[PDB]
Automatic annotation (TrEMBL), chain A:
Mg(2+) 2 binds at Q48, E132, Q135. Mg(2+) 1 binds at E19, E52, H55. Belongs to the ferritin family. Prokaryotic subfamily. Mg(2+) 4 binds at E51, E128, E131, E132. This is Ferritin. Residues 2-145 form the Ferritin-like diiron domain. Ca(2+) 5 binds at N105, E108. Zn(2+) 2 binds at H43, E138. Fe(3+) 3 binds at E19, E52, H55, E132. Pfam families: Ferritin. Zn(2+) 4 binds at E52, E96, E132.
């Protein structure tokens, strides 16, 4: 019933678990901000946390509409503390660039397999990822002022 | 054409709404730049660019479904607002109109069992919810 390859289902499945860890990382950034009493930065991390679950569930439902199956993996414990405000956001940017590269790797994999549906599915996330990296760069830019 | 004329017209209308939103955000950049709010202006210019990418998504989807795009005249946007908060409230009010308009196309596309168009729009429903919350977040931070 699967109209994607195993290599593609696997890579999509891996990304879903990365989106889940992303939500968890952002949640853990919330705990740091909130403990430092930066309640607005924390509110942004909790919103980002809920959005990354939106990302993960988008991968979920794509995997299944293409006849695949999802296996959830263990979620590593995220850091719960950073050396200041700028450093936590630098970590967010670092993580978002990591997510971007991983999505790029799936896109090239899907193109070499002539998988049009998965290429087209992924282009939506490339744009969101460009937006999400620029968001952090803007925050970092404004903090060094 | 594998979309109905009703959906095509709805999608072409939204394309022109994205085109206008881009021009609105550019106009807001002219205001922020005039007033020295250079960083705000950069946000507007990036948003103007993004709204154009929204326009070209609808463009390509229409042609991919066998429809045609027709570009309408672009209204002159406001040039000036009464301060930063006023500029961002207008943005928020404009985003809410864009959100409603997309839902109306989603409603119509569902009723016609146009599955491809439902699936296309659900990306925009989610982007719209984020874009609304971004400017709402700005406004809350301005009350400060
Ligand atoms: Co808040
Ligand atoms: Co994500
Ligand atoms: Co992200
Ligand atoms: Co977005
Ligand atoms: Co986002
Ligand atoms: Co910038
Ligand atoms: Co800037
Ligand atoms: Co738009
Ligand atoms: Co918009
Ligand atoms: Co956006
Ligand atoms: Co808020």
């Amino acid at each position: 019933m699967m109209v994607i390859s195993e290599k593609v289902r696997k890579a999509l499945n891996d990304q879903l678990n990365r989106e889940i860890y992303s939500s968890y990382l952002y949640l853990s950034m919330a705990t740091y901000f909130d403990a430092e009493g930066f309640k607005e930065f924390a509110h942004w991390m909790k919103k980002q946390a809920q959005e990354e679950l939106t990302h993960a569930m988008k991968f979920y439902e794509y995997i299944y509409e293409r006849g695949g199956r999802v296996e959830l993996e263990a979620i590593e414990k995220p850091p719960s503390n950073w050396n200041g405000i700028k450093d936590a956001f630098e970590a967010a940017l670092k993580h978002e660039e990591f997510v971007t590269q991983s999505i790029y790797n799936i896109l090239e994999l899907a193109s070499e397999e002539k998988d049009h549906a998965t290429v087209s599915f992924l282009k939506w996330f490339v744009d969101e990822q460009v937006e999400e990296e620029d968001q952090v760069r803007e925050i970092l830019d404004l903090l060094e002022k």
